[PDB]
Symmetry: D2
């Protein structure tokens, strides 16, 4: 998978399961077009978001529906969602993992980009 998303829960100390993940790509007219989506599994990942042929250079947005996740756990959250906006750049072979660590009033995100 050229693009992987991993969601972790800082309160329970576990992968964040059943979280909706939406991916968008910026079109030529500067609007967000739905690209891929899924629900995280027991591993905190929504497996199989895209393919190497589809995941071309461009500007992408990964939206994680954190509010629904915290509401399901009964914890009052601050954010409506967590969004990660980045440019995908070909510079030799690349694999992107967008990882997010969630708390009710905070989130962290990092990118792990490997050859």
């Amino acid at each position: 998978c050229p693009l992987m998303v991993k969601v972790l829960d800082a309160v329970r100390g576990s992968p964040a399961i059943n979280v909706a993940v939406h991916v968008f790509r910026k079109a030529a007219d500067d609007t967000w077009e739905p690209f891929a989506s899924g629900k995280t599994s027991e591993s905190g990942e929504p497996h199989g978001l895209t393919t190497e042929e589809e995941f071309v250079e461009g500007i992408y947005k990964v939206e994680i529906d954190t509010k629904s996740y915290w509401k399901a756990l009964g914890i009052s959250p601050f954010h409506e969602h967590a969004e990660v906006v980045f440019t995908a750049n070909d510079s030799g072979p690349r694999r992107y993992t967008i990882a997010a660590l969630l708390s009710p009033y905070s989130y962290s995100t990092t990118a792990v980009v490997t050859n």
Copy 2:
């Protein structure tokens, strides 16, 4: 100030200075309307974003221009910006401090809500 933003640089160990901060508020037609903007000072904060009378209930987005910040420092970062989307003043007026900690391939955000 009912809405404060503090931006920190995890590489240099300093406030992130001269960073552009843009705030939007969601309109009834579900579009994002410009609400306020500023530039961080030597303390990593843009002083005087809004007022008590203007900062009404709503869904707000704070966009911190991290890409321009890292580029000005000679680093090609991963993210286009650090975003923070939240509902404000839904249980009465509060003071919100949005803090962001920046690295070239990661960022964290947290909210401190007082009153």
Copy 3:
């Protein structure tokens, strides 16, 4: 204050109040000597840890008692404490702000060094 500590709670969206902070300084015999201690106030900071004259060059450890904090809130957390070990004043006197953001199964720490 040459050494400031700010503790934030990522679950409640507030400063972490009544948290014990212990500071040690490494002695010539490679053992940790007690240096200062305090309790965070309503702003999440223990006011007046040390002075310019006492805060000499050395290797310091700031231990934040996160386990007692979470237990007092009814949470059984993962960590015993949040630690921060650093060399201070090696390139002349500086002001250090050690910030920690806490969750039951995670914590982050950052330093802001000024002067």
Copy 4:
């Protein structure tokens, strides 16, 4: 592996490779006894730290030699190392992953505890 350590680099956007990881267990006399150690691989993990028979309940310390890692990259770091101190508790089957995300002036750590 009942105990796994994963180290990520927030500056390069990759696993932190060739990082020394030291694990200690608190003995009955309240001193830190070396338990296991290794160097992170290309995946950011020092594979095979312990076994299920050896990894009993107790207080453990995971020390990550961050300073040597940043010095090898030529970046001035703040911390002498990153330390994670926690209690291992049997409450049905458990597998512990200690993850750390590194920056020169900041580190984050989380625990992912699975059945």
